[PDB]
Amino acid sequence: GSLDGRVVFITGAARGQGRSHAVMCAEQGANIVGVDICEDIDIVPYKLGTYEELEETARLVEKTGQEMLFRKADVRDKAVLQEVFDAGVEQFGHIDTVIANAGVVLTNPDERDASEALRLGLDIMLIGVWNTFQVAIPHMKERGQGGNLIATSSMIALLDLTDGRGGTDAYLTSKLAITGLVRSYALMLAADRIRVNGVAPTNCSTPMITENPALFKVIEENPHLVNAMSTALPDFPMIEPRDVSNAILFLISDAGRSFTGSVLKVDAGMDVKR
Amino acid sequence: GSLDGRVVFITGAARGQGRSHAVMCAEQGANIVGVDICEDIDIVPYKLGTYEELEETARLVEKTGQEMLFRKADVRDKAVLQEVFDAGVEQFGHIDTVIANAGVVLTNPDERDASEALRLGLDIMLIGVWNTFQVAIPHMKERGQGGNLIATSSMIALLDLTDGRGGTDAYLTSKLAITGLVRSYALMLAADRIRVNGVAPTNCSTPMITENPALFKVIEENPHLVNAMSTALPDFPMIEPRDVSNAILFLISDAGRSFTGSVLKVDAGMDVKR
Ligand SMILES: NC(=O)c1ccc[n+]([C@@H]2O[C@H](COP(=O)([O-])OP(=O)(O)OC[C@H]3O[C@@H](n4cnc5c(N)ncnc54)[C@H](O)[C@@H]3O)[C@@H](O)[C@H]2O)c1
Numbered sequence: 001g002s003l004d005g006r007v008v009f010i011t012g013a014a015r016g017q018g019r020s021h022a023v024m025c026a027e028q029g030a031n032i033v034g035v036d037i038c039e040d041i042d043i044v045p046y047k048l049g050t051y052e053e054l055e056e057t058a059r060l061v062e063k064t065g066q067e068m069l070f071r072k073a074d075v076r077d078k079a080v081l082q083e084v085f086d087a088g089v090e091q092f093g094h095i096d097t098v099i100a101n102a103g104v105v106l107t108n109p110d111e112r113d114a115s116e117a118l119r120l121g122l123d124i125m126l127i128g129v130w131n132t133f134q135v136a137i138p139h140m141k142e143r144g145q146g147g148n149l150i151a152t153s154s155m156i157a158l159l160d161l162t163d164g165r166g167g168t169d170a171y172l173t174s175k176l177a178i179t180g181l182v183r184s185y186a187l188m189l190a191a192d193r194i195r196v197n198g199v200a201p202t203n204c205s206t207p208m209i210t211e212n213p214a215l216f217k218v219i220e221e222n223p224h225l226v227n228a229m230s231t232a233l234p235d236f237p238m239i240e241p242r243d244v245s246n247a248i249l250f251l252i253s254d255a256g257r258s259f260t261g262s263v264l265k266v267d268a269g270m271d272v273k274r
Numbered sequence: 275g276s277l278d279g280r281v282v283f284i285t286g287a288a289r290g291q292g293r294s295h296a297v298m299c300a301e302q303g304a305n306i307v308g309v310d311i312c313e314d315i316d317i318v319p320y321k322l323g324t325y326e327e328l329e330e331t332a333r334l335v336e337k338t339g340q341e342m343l344f345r346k347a348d349v350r351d352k353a354v355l356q357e358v359f360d361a362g363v364e365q366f367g368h369i370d371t372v373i374a375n376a377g378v379v380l381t382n383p384d385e386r387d388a389s390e391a392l393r394l395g396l397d398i399m400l401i402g403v404w405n406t407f408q409v410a411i412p413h414m415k416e417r418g419q420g421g422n423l424i425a426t427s428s429m430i431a432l433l434d435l436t437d438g439r440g441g442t443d444a445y446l447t448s449k450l451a452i453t454g455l456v457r458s459y460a461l462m463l464a465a466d467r468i469r470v471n472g473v474a475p476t477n478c479s480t481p482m483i484t485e486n487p488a489l490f491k492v493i494e495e496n497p498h499l500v501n502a503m504s505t506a507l508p509d510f511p512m513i514e515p516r517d518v519s520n521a522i523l524f525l526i527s528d529a530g531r532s533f534t535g536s537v538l539k540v541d542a543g544m545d546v547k548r
């Protein structure tokens with residue numbers, strides 16, 4: 001496959017897009033180092049990924065013939081992230097690819113404290129992404145075989161839709177900010193042959209959307225968010241996780257070898273929809 | 275392959291990226307309908323593609339086991355383009371994919387007439403692209419199986435570099451304009467399931483660059499164009515045609531199935547280089 005000899009570090013691998021990334025990278029020959037918080041968060045109004053789901057991701061990876069090192073870990077805990085990464089380097093010899101995918105949706109009409117939700121969103125989706133890159137770069141430079149960093153942004157966030165609650169604003173500002181991290185790190189790391197890109201998905205069928213009524217009530221409550229989620233293509237009112245994985249696969253494989261500094265819109269035309 | 279049962283109409287197929295598109299689409303199962311001007315143009319200061327080169331593209335396609343209908347035709351000649359397209363529909367049953375690739379570089383310190391070069395550039399790279407979409411859309415709608423339109427933009431053009439000669443300005447304005455055609459047509463045609471995207475390559479090793487001294491003398495003559503061509507990635511001071519073909523293949527295949535309205539930067543980081 002396209003990822004033979006590759007080793008991918010993936011945050012948020014318990015389910016959804018992260019699990020899709022793990023399974024589909026392994027199909028192309030990659031070994032996987034995955035983490036997930038494996039705990040709910042009080043102010044996030046839907047169930048997060050479980051340890052049991054993370055195990056299942058590993059089993060799905062192992063059905064491909066590849067291997068997965070999986071650990072419970074929070075991207076806010078930088079030292080823990082580094083320890084799991086280092087254990088990855090030990091088990092597999094190296095890590096050459098990083099997918100910073102972990103995130104949460106904080107949209108909630110019953111948000112209790114705006115400043116708190118803002119801080120939490122930023123911690124997970126901005127600082128957490130930065131942590132995920134930080135634990136990897138020294139190693140990628142050291143081993144001198146270049147590499148790939150990938151961050152998961154969001155199309156909906158790049159369309160300037162907020163209800164002005166703290167959680168929503170954290171999501172928008174984090175997801176935009178990380179496109180800057182992508183572009184700036186692409187330039188910074190070019191000379192080390194570390195390519196850096198992102199993906200900006202439109203609505204993707206995962207629990208964050210499919211089991212999160214709070215979200216539907218917030219767009220139902222605001223006139224300016226009435227068409228917040230609509231896409232262009234009739235067959236894709238939402239996309240599937242594999243669509244996102246396929247974009248990443250393109251970017252990190254020989255097919256997309258010259259790409260760095262790009263954020264691909266996996267959006268079913270959401271960006272042009274007017 | 276990824277393009278089994280597909281039929282691709284390609285302008286500028288004699289050589290370079292167009293030939294790469296034809297050969298690499300055919301490798302994935304596609305039959306090809308290709309055209310090229312097959313003539314030099316007086317005010318373009320390098321040799322254009324020949325009839326012999328177009329024949330060779332067809333031979334390369336046929337070595338894959340697929341078929342190519344090839345004709346000498348100018349994208350400025352809309353009725354001729356339509357005729358060749360219709361003959362394609364005839365020979366192969368349908369055309370579901372269009373790649374508007376034909377173009378020329380009009381950079382030339384010895385430009386004789388600015389207004390003339392401006393007009394010619396626009397005719398070929400703006401109106402010519404519009405013609406290429408126009409000949410295909412009625413059929414794609416009629417046949418009702420959706421489809422793909424692809425236009426070739428340019429990274430260097432999207433970086434706002436001109437010497438203010440007519441030819442250079444035609445190139446910059448046409449290549450930018452066609453990103454608008456891409457986004458607007460993506461929206462327009464979404465309901466017909468016709469997906470519309472573009473590619474913006476950085477410097478690509480073809481005669482337009484490799485056998486065009488005029489170009490090097492124009493950047494050598496202007497202080498503000500000293501670093502006009504530099505990319506970020508050390509291994510890609512230029513890219514190869516297959517890099518562009520791989521990006522198109524992603525977009526038009528099931529892998530890139532939700533993409534519409536996008537312009538992919540096949541740029542080795544040129545867009546972030548500063
Ligand atoms: N689903 C969508 O519509 C959509 C659209 C655009 C972007 N996104 C983004 O895609 C990414 C993946 O989301 P998904 O759709 O797969 O949803 P998901 O909630 O099904 O998966 C995300 C996973 O990340 C984990 N996670 C959350 N916080 C964490 C933390 N602090 N540390 C470690 N792991 C953590 C969760 O437990 C869960 O397993 C997220 O960054 C999300 O913001 C999602």
Ligand SMILES: NC(=O)c1ccc[n+]([C@@H]2O[C@H](COP(=O)([O-])OP(=O)(O)OC[C@H]3O[C@@H](n4cnc5c(N)ncnc54)[C@H](O)[C@@H]3O)[C@@H](O)[C@H]2O)c1
Pocket residue numbers: 285286287288289290291292309310311312313322323324347348349350375376377378379398402426427428429430474475476477478479480481482483
């Ligand atoms: N080479 C680069 O660095 C570069 C960078 C960015 C974008 N582009 C674009 O990529 C496209 C392909 O160029 P290439 O690099 O393969 O160069 P090329 O010169 O090798 O190929 C272009 C082909 O288009 C044909 N052509 C020109 N005018 C035509 C017309 N009016 N009708 C029909 N055919 C015509 C030529 O005969 C030639 O065979 C062009 O649109 C160009 O503007 C090129």
